[PDB]
Amino acid sequence: KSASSLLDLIWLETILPKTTSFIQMKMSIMVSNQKGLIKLYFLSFLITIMISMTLFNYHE
Amino acid sequence: KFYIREPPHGSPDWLKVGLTLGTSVFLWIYLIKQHKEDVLEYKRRNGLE
Amino acid sequence: MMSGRPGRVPLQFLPNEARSLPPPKLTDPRLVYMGFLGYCSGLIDNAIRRRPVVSAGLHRQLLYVTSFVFFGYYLLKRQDYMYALRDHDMFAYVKSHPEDFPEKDKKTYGEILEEFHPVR
Amino acid sequence: MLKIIIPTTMLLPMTWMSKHNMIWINATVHSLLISLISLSLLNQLGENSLNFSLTFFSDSLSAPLLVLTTWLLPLMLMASQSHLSKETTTRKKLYITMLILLQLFLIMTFTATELILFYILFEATLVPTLIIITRWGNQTERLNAGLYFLFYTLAGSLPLLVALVYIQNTTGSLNFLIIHYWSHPLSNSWSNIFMWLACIMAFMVKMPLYGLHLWLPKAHVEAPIAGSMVLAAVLLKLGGYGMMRITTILNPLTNYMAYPFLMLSMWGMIMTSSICLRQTDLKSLIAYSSVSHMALVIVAIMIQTPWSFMGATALMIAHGLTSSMLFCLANTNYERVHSRTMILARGLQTLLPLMATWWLMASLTNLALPPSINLIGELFIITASFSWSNITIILMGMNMMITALYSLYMLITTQRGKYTHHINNIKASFTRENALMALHILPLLLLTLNPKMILGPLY
Amino acid sequence: LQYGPLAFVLGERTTRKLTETSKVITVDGNICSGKGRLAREIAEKLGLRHFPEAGIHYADSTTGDGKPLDVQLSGNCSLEKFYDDPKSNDGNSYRLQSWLYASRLLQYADALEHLLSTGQGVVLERSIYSDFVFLEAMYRQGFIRKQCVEHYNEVKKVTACEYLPPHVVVYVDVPVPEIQSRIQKKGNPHEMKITAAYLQDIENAYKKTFLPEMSEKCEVLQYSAREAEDAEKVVEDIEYLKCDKGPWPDQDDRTFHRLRMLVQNKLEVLNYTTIPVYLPEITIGAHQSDRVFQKFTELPGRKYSPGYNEDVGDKWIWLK
Amino acid sequence: KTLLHKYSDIPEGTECHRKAYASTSIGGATGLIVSAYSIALKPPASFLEGVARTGRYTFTSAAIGAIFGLTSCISAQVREKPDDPLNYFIGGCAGGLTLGARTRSYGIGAAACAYMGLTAALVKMGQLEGWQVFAEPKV
Amino acid sequence: IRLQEDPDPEDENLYEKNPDSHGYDKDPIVDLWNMRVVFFFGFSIVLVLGSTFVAYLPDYRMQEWARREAERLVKYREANGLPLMESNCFDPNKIQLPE
Amino acid sequence: MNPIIYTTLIMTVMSGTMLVMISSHWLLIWIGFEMNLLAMIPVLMKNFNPRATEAATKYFLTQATASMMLMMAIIINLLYSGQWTITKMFNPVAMTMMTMALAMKLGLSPFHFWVPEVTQGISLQAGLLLLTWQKLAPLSVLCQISQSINPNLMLTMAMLSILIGGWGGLNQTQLRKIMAYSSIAHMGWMTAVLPYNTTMTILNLLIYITMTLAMFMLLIHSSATTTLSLSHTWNKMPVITSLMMVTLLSMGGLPPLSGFMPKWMIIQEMTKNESIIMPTLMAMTALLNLYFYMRLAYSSSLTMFPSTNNMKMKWQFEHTKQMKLLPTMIVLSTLVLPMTPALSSLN
Amino acid sequence: DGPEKNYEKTMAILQIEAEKAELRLKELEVRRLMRARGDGPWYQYPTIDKALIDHSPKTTPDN
Amino acid sequence: MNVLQIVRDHWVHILVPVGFVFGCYLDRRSDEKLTAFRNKSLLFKRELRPNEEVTWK
Amino acid sequence: MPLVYMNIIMAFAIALAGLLMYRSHLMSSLLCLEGMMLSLFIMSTLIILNTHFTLANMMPIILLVFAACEAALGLSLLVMVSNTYGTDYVQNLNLLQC
Numbered sequence A: 001k002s003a004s005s006l007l008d009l010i011w012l013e014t015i016l017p018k019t020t021s022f023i024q025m026k027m028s029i030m031v032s033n034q035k036g037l038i039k040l041y042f043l044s045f046l047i048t049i050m051i052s053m054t055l056f057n058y059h060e
Numbered sequence B: 001k002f003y004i005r006e007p008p009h010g011s012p013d014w015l016k017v018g019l020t021l022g023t024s025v026f027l028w029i030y031l032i033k034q035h036k037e038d039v040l041e042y043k044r045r046n047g048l049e
Numbered sequence C: 001m002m003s004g005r006p007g008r009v010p011l012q013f014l015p016n017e018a019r020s021l022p023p024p025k026l027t028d029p030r031l032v033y034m035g036f037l038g039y040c041s042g043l044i045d046n047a048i049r050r051r052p053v054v055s056a057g058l059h060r061q062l063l064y065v066t067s068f069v070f071f072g073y074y075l076l077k078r079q080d081y082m083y084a085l086r087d088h089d090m091f092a093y094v095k096s097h098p099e100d101f102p103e104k105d106k107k108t109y110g111e112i113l114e115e116f117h118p119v120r
Numbered sequence D: 001m002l003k004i005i006i007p008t009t010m011l012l013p014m015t016w017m018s019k020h021n022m023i024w025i026n027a028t029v030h031s032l033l034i035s036l037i038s039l040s041l042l043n044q045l046g047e048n049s050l051n052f053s054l055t056f057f058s059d060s061l062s063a064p065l066l067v068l069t070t071w072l073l074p075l076m077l078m079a080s081q082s083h084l085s086k087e088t089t090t091r092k093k094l095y096i097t098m099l100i101l102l103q104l105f106l107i108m109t110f111t112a113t114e115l116i117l118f119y120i121l122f123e124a125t126l127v128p129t130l131i132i133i134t135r136w137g138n139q140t141e142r143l144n145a146g147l148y149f150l151f152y153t154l155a156g157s158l159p160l161l162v163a164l165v166y167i168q169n170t171t172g173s174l175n176f177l178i179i180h181y182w183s184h185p186l187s188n189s190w191s192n193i194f195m196w197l198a199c200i201m202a203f204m205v206k207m208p209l210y211g212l213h214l215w216l217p218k219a220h221v222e223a224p225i226a227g228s229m230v231l232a233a234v235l236l237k238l239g240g241y242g243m244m245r246i247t248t249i250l251n252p253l254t255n256y257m258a259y260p261f262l263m264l265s266m267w268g269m270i271m272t273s274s275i276c277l278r279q280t281d282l283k284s285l286i287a288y289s290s291v292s293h294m295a296l297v298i299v300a301i302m303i304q305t306p307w308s309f310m311g312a313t314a315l316m317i318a319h320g321l322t323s324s325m326l327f328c329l330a331n332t333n334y335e336r337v338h339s340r341t342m343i344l345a346r347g348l349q350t351l352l353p354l355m356a357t358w359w360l361m362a363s364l365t366n367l368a369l370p371p372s373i374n375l376i377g378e379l380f381i382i383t384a385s386f387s388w389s390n391i392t393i394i395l396m397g398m399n400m401m402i403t404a405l406y407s408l409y410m411l412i413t414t415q416r417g418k419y420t421h422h423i424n425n426i427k428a429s430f431t432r433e434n435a436l437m438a439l440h441i442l443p444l445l446l447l448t449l450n451p452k453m454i455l456g457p458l459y
Numbered sequence E: 001l002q003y004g005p006l007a008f009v010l011g012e013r014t015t016r017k018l019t020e021t022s023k024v025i026t027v028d029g030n031i032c033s034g035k036g037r038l039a040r041e042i043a044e045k046l047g048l049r050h051f052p053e054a055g056i057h058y059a060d061s062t063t064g065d066g067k068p069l070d071v072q073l074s075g076n077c078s079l080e081k082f083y084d085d086p087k088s089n090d091g092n093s094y095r096l097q098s099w100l101y102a103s104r105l106l107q108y109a110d111a112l113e114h115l116l117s118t119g120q121g122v123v124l125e126r127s128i129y130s131d132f133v134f135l136e137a138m139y140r141q142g143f144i145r146k147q148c149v150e151h152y153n154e155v156k157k158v159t160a161c162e163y164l165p166p167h168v169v170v171y172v173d174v175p176v177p178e179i180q181s182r183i184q185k186k187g188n189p190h191e192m193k194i195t196a197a198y199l200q201d202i203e204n205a206y207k208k209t210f211l212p213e214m215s216e217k218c219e220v221l222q223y224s225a226r227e228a229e230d231a232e233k234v235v236e237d238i239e240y241l242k243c244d245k246g247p248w249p250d251q252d253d254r255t256f257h258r259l260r261m262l263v264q265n266k267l268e269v270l271n272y273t274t275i276p277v278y279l280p281e282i283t284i285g286a287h288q289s290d291r292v293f294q295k296f297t298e299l300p301g302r303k304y305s306p307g308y309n310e311d312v313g314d315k316w317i318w319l320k
Numbered sequence F: 001k002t003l004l005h006k007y008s009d010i011p012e013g014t015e016c017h018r019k020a021y022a023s024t025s026i027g028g029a030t031g032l033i034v035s036a037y038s039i040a041l042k043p044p045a046s047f048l049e050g051v052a053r054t055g056r057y058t059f060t061s062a063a064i065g066a067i068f069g070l071t072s073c074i075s076a077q078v079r080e081k082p083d084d085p086l087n088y089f090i091g092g093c094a095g096g097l098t099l100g101a102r103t104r105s106y107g108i109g110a111a112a113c114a115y116m117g118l119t120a121a122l123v124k125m126g127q128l129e130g131w132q133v134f135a136e137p138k139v
Numbered sequence G: 001i002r003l004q005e006d007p008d009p010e011d012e013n014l015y016e017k018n019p020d021s022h023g024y025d026k027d028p029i030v031d032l033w034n035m036r037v038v039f040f041f042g043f044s045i046v047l048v049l050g051s052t053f054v055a056y057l058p059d060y061r062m063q064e065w066a067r068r069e070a071e072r073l074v075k076y077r078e079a080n081g082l083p084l085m086e087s088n089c090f091d092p093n094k095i096q097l098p099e
Numbered sequence H: 001m002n003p004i005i006y007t008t009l010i011m012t013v014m015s016g017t018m019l020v021m022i023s024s025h026w027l028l029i030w031i032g033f034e035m036n037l038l039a040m041i042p043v044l045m046k047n048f049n050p051r052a053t054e055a056a057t058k059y060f061l062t063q064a065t066a067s068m069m070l071m072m073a074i075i076i077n078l079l080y081s082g083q084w085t086i087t088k089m090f091n092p093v094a095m096t097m098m099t100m101a102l103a104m105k106l107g108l109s110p111f112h113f114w115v116p117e118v119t120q121g122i123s124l125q126a127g128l129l130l131l132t133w134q135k136l137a138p139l140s141v142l143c144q145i146s147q148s149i150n151p152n153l154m155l156t157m158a159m160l161s162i163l164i165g166g167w168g169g170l171n172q173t174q175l176r177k178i179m180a181y182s183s184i185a186h187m188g189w190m191t192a193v194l195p196y197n198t199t200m201t202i203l204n205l206l207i208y209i210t211m212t213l214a215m216f217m218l219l220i221h222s223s224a225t226t227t228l229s230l231s232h233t234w235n236k237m238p239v240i241t242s243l244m245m246v247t248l249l250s251m252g253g254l255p256p257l258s259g260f261m262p263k264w265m266i267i268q269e270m271t272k273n274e275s276i277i278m279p280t281l282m283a284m285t286a287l288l289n290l291y292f293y294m295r296l297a298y299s300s301s302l303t304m305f306p307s308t309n310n311m312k313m314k315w316q317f318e319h320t321k322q323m324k325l326l327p328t329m330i331v332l333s334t335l336v337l338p339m340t341p342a343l344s345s346l347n
Numbered sequence I: 001d002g003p004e005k006n007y008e009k010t011m012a013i014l015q016i017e018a019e020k021a022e023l024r025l026k027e028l029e030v031r032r033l034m035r036a037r038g039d040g041p042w043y044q045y046p047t048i049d050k051a052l053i054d055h056s057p058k059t060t061p062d063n
Numbered sequence J: 001m002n003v004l005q006i007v008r009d010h011w012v013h014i015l016v017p018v019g020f021v022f023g024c025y026l027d028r029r030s031d032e033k034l035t036a037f038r039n040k041s042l043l044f045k046r047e048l049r050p051n052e053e054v055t056w057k
Numbered sequence K: 001m002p003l004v005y006m007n008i009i010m011a012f013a014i015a016l017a018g019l020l021m022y023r024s025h026l027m028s029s030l031l032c033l034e035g036m037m038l039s040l041f042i043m044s045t046l047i048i049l050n051t052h053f054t055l056a057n058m059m060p061i062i063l064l065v066f067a068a069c070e071a072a073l074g075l076s077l078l079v080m081v082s083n084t085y086g087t088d089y090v091q092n093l094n095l096l097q098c
C-alpha cells in the first residue's frame, strides 16, 4: 500500500507522465478545434496585428 | 506466358540500358580525368611542380 | 559564416582559385560513403517496384552509384573551398587586427593558485 | 578500433542475404568470433587510454563493456531461436539486423572519443530498441511501453544536447581527453547548477532512479525475450559510462549538488527493494531488483571516490550479467507456460532438475555473495560510502537485507515446493536454454577469478 | 508506353475513335433470366465485345495466369454455401455481396478501358448501378444486417460517382414461376433452395428502383424472355436509338482523358473498395492477413513484377 | 513594454504596494490579451455573456498578478533579501493556488504551485544572472 | 463471429514430433550443426583460449613492472635514510610561493 | 485539366518563385508572389470538389491580404528611403509589416489557421506542391532582409509556429492535417534560426523539403488520407510501410537519421550566440511532433491492423505510376548525417 | 604494439585536438568581431552599386 | 562435389574474416596518417639505429 | 509628412479593418480588398509624382495591372462557391471543418 500501488502505480506515473499528457490533452482540443469560419480566423489576424504593432510595439 | 498481358518490363529495353551504361562510363572517365587535372593543376600552381 | 564576400561570382559552383587547394582523393572516406550512399538509393529502388532487390537491373544501380559519387566529388571541393576561405580570411583578419587579439601570456601551473577541492 | 567495428558492420549483409535457415548459424558463429577479437582489447597500457584514431579510443573503463556487448550478441541471438522460428524469413533477417545495428551502435558509443559523437550514438540506441519492443512484442501494453521508454529517454537527452553544444562553444572542444586535461572548477554560479543538471539528468533518465523508474518496469515486462536482456544489460550502463566521463568537468559543484539525487538513490534502492517483496510478475521482480542495483551504482558514481568508481565499474558488468541471467529464466518459464504470473507455477525443481540449479546460482549471484564479482563490486561501494558519510551503511544494509529476501523468495515460490497440478505441458528443458545460462554463468566466475580486467580504469 | 500525359500531348485523342459502335449496354434481370444468352447474341449481332458476368473469380480471370484461385485465397465467400445457409451470418452473405460488387467494379473498369482504348461497344451482365438490388433483397430476407447494407450504399456512392453510366440496358423480365422452372431445368443443386420470396423480391427491387433510378441517365428497353430468345429485334431497336440522354452525349476529350487515366490504373479504380471502415464480416484478422500473405507471395508470378519473376522463368534480369 | 518597466523599475521589497499595482496591471494586460483571443476565436451568443467571459479571464489573471506582486515584495522585505528565487516562488505559486480556486479546482491549483512557482523562480533566476530569453544576433 | 480469424495455434515442442532434437530448429541436421557451433567457440576457444588470453595478457598497467621498479627506489632511499615515501610528490623548490 | 495546361501552370508557379529569388527590385518580388498566387489557385482546383473550392478560397483570401500588406511595407520603405532595392529596411514599422505579410504566406503565427484547412481540402499532390514549393519564395525574401528583423518578433513568431504546430497535430487523424501541422512546426524550426544565420535555415529548408517529398510520394504511393486507410496499407505495401516507418523516425530527429541534423545545427548556433533558454523550448516541444509521429508509425507498420476481405484482390494489381525520384528521395532524407560538413557548401 | 606506439600516437591526437579547439574559440571571436565592426571580408551586407548613377548633364541644372 | 553449388549456398562465412583483416589494414593506414611525433616522444627519444629507419609502423 | 499622406494611410488602415474584419459577406470583403489597392495606388502615385521618379511613374499601372487580376479571380472564385452554396454569405462556408 505504500511502495507499490500508491507510490509507483499511483503517484509517480500521475505526476510526470499522466499530468503532462493531460496538459497536452487539455491544450490540444483548445488549440485544434476551430470550426473553420473565416471570420474568427481573420479577427485572430486582427488583434495579432495590433499586438505586434502597438501593444508590444515590436518596432519600438 | 503465365500472365496473359504482356509484362510492362518483360523485354530488355535495350536503348535505356545502353544510355545508362554509356552515362556511367562517361561520368567515371570524366571523374578520373577531372581528378588528374586537378592534382596536376595543384602541383603546378602552388610550386610543387 | 559569407554571401557578401568581395569578388564572389554568383551561380558559380567551383571558383577558379579553389584549384590551389588539394583536390579530394578518389579514396576519400567521405566520398566512398557517398558512393555507398548510392547503393542505398539503388537497393531501395528495386524494393519500391517489388523487383528483386539484390540484382534487379544493375544498369540502374550503376548510374545510381556513379552519379552520387560524382556530385559528391564536386561538393567536396566546394566543401573544402568554403572551409579554406573561412580559415583564410580568418588569419587575414587576425593579422590585420593585432589589437583585438592580445598575446595572452603563458604561465606554468607553478605560478597559478588553483585551489584543490576535497571531494569526500 | 576498426578491427572490431568493421567486422560488425560488414556482418550485416551476411545475415541479410544468407539462406533462409543458415542465417541463425552464421550470425551466431560470426558473433562468437568477433567477440573473440573483442576480448583482445582488455589490454590497457599503464594509465593511458588505449588510443586508436582521432575519433575512436578505449580504456579499462570501456573494454569490459565492449567485450560484454560482443559476448551478449550471441546470447539473445540464439535465445531468439524459440521465439522467432515461426515468422517470415525476411522478418527474421530484419530482426537480426536490428540486433546487429544495436550492438554496432553500442560499440560505437563506448569507443567514442569526442562528446557529441557519443551523444549521437547514445540516442541512436533507441531506434533499434524501440523497433524491437514495439514490433516483436507479445501483449497489448507494449505500445505504451515503447511510448514511455522513448519519451523518457528523449526528455532526458535533449537538455544534454543543449548543454553539450554550449560546452563546445565555451570551452573549445568536446574531446574526452582534453576536457579531462583542460578541466576547470565548475563554480557555484546559478547557471552552473543548471549546467550540471543538464549534463547529469540525461544519464540519470536511463539509469532508473527513485521516481523516474516507470519505463523499465513497463517496458521490460513485455519486451521481446531477446530484446529485454539487451535493455536490462547494456543501455543502463552506457549512461554509467556517460557519468564516468562527464563527471570530470562537473566538479567541484558535484560535492553538494549531488545530495538530492544521492539520497534519492539510497532510500530509492530500498523502495525498489521494498517494492521487490511483492510482485505479481517475475519479469517485474527482476526489473525492480535491477532498479535497486542501478540505484546502488548511482550512489557509487556520485561520491567521486576511486573505490566507489571500482565498485561501480564492477557493478555494471555484474548486474547486467545477473539481470539478463534471470531474464532468460523468466523467458523460459513463460514460454513453457505462456503466462508471466508469479505464483502460477511453484516447485519447478520437481520437473526440471537442472533448470532450478541454474535458478540457484542465478539468485546466488543476485545475492552478491563472496567471492563473486557481484560481492566485490558491492563491497567497494560499501567501503567508499562508509568513508563518505559513516551511517550510509544503515540504508545500504537494508538493501543487502532485502535483496536475498526477494531473490530466495522467488526460488521458493518458483522452484521449491511442488508443481501446481493443473499445468501438464511442461516438457523437459531443451539444451538451448541450459546451454545459454551456462555461457552466461560460467564466464561470470571466470572473469571473477581475474577481477583486474573489470576492476576499473583507476587501477 | 501506356496512355500517359505524353500520349494526350503528342496527339492521342479518344474522340477520334468513338462512333455509334461505342454503346455500353448491360443485360439485367432476375437470376437465370437468360440474359447471358441475350448478351452473347447482342454482342455478336452488333460487333460489340462481350464480357462474361464477373463472379467470385474475376480477379484471376483478369490478372495473372487466368486460373481460378482458392476461395480462401480469393473472396473467402461461397454463393453455393450462401444458398446452403443464408442466415448463419458467419459472413458469407455480405462478404459475397461486397466481393461481387467490387468484381463488377473491376469489370466495368476494364470495359470502359477497352472502349476508350479501342472504340468498340461493350455489353455486360449487371453493373454497379444494378447489383444493389440483390443486396436490398438479401436484406429483406434478413441475410445481411443493416450496417452491412448502409456500408454497401456508402461504398456505392463513393465508387460509382466517378463512373459515367451505360448507354442502354436491356432487362429480361421473367415471372417468378418461370424462373423457378429454369433453375429446376439447370441441375446444379446449389441453386435449387432459393426462396420464392427472394426471387420475387429482387424483381421488385429491380422494377421499382433500378429502372426509374436509371431511366433519367439512360434508355430503358426492358424485355421478356419471349422476345429475348429472338436476337434480331433486340438488336434492331438497340441500333435505332438516339442515345442522347446522360453524361455520355456531353463529355469532351478532357473527360475522356481523365477517364482513361483512371481506368488504365486499376489500383485506384477500386481504392475505396478497401473499405476503410471496420465491420465484423468484412474485417479479416491481422494474423489471418499475414498468413494469407505468406501463402500468396510465394505463389508463382506474384512475388516480383511481371517479367522480373525468375521463379517462372524470366530472363536477362541482371540487365532488366 | 513600459508596463513591464513599471514592474522592473520598482525594486523588490521597497514600495511593495506600487510593485503589486504594476503586477496587477501586467496580469490585467495578459488577461485582456487572452480575453481578446477568446472573444475573437471562440464565438459567444450575447454581448453580456461575452464580456462576462472577458471579465472572468481578466479578473483571474489580475488576481494572480496582484498576489504575486504583493507576496513577492513582502517576502523581499521581511527577509530583506530581494535576491531570492524563493521570494518569487512562494508568491508565484500561491498565484497558482488562487488560479485553481478561481476555476474551483484545488487539484490543478496544487499542480500549479509546482509549475507557476518554478517558472517565477526561473524568471527571477534569469533576471539576477542576465539569462536572455530573446537573444540578439551577436555571432 | 465479429471477425474471420485463425484460432491460436498450438505451441509445438520439437521433441514430440522429432525426438533427439535440441530446441534449435525443425530440421534435425541443422539442429546438430547449431549444437556444434554453439558448443564450439561459445564454450570453446572464446570461452577457454579466451580465458588464457585474458589471464595471460601483457603487463596490466605495468603493475608487474611497477612492482619490480619500486624496491629499487626503496633501497636507494633507505641507503641514505630518506624514507620510501614523501610528503610531497611535486617538488616545492621548482614551484613558486604566491606572495 | 489539359496536360499541357497543367504543365503551363507548373512552370508559371515555378517561374513566379524564380522571379522572387532572382529579382532585386521590390516590385518584382511582389509580382513574382502574385504570379505564384494566380498560378497555384487553378491546380488546387484540379479535382473540383467543394472541399477544393473551400481550400482555394481560403488560400486566395489569406495570400491576397498578405500580398497587399507586402505592398504596404513596400510603399512605406519607399516613402521613407526612396529605394526599391531589397536590403535592410529604413523604417521599423515597414519591417514589421513585411514580417507579418510574409508570415501569413508562410503560416507561422496565428496567421497559420489557413494551411491545415487548405491542406485538408486539396488532393495530396496539390498538398506536396503547397507544402514544398510555396515556401521557397517567402523564405528567400526573409533571408534577403535578415539584416534588420526585430529578433523578438521573429523568435516569438517561430515559437508559436512550432508550439501550435505540435499541439494541433495531436488531435488529427487525416494525414494531410497532421502533415500540415508538422510543416508548421518545421516552419517555426527554420524561422527561429532565420535571424541568426541564414545558412542553417537554408539547410533546414532543404532537409524539410526532401523529407516532405519523401513523405508525400509515399502517401500517394499508398493512396491513403486517413490513419485507418494507411493502417489498411500495412498489407499491400509492406516495403512502402516500412519506409513509411523509417522516414517517420527521421521526422522527429532521432539520431543518426537526417532529421536530427537540422535540429542539432540550429541548437548549436543558437547556443553560440548566448541563446540557451530558447533552443530548449523547441527541443522539448519536438516531442509533441514525435508523439503523433509514433502514433502514425504504430498505425502503419509496428502493429498489424485489421485488413478487409475485398482488399485481397488489390494483391492482383501493381502500382503503374512510377512516381520517380522516390528511392533517392528516401535515401537523402534518411542517411546524410555523416555529411553534415557539406552545409558549408550553402554558405 | 609497444607502449611507445600508443603514447606517440596519442600526444599527436591531443595536439591536433588542441590546435582545433583554440581555432574554434578564435573563430567564435572573429565571427563576432566581424559581425559587429564589419571591417573585413564576410558578414558584409550588400549596398547600392555606384555604376547605376548617371553623371551626364540633365534638363535642369543643380541636380 | 558440386563446389559451385556449395559456394552458391555457403559463401557467407568468408566475408566476415576478410572484413576483419580489412579493419587491421585500415588501422595500419590510420597509423601512417598520425606519425607527427616520429621518435619525438620525450621518454622514448631512443636513437635510431643505423640498420632500421622507423620507430614503429 | 503632410495630411494627404495621413488620409490615404488612414484609408488603407480602415480598408484593412473592413476587409479583414469580416462582417458577413464575401463579395463586399473582396470589394474592400480591391479598395485597399486603390488606397495603395494613390499613395504610391503621390511620392512618385512628388520626387520626380520618372521611371517609377510606370510602377502604379504595373501595380494596378496585377491587382485587378487578383480581383479577376476573386469574384471568379465567388461564383464557384455561389452556384453550389447559393450565396456569398460566409457562415455556411463551413464544409471544410476537419
Ligand SMILES: Nc1nc2c(ncn2[C@@H]2O[C@H](COP(=O)(O)OP(=O)(O)OP(=O)(O)O)[C@@H](O)[C@H]2O)c(=O)[nH]1
Residues within 6 Å of the ligand: E030, E031, E032, E033, E034, E035, E036, E037, E053, E079, E096, E097, E100, E101, E126, E131, E132, E134, E135, E186, E191
Ligand atoms: N448475391 C448476389 N448474387 C448475384 C449477384 N449478381 C449475380 N448473382 C448470382 O449470379 C448467379 C448467376 O446468375 P444468372 O447469370 O442470371 O444465372 P444463370 O443460371 O447463369 O443463367 P443466365 O442468366 O442465362 O446466365 C446467380 O446465382 C445469382 O444469384 C449479386 O449482385 N448478388
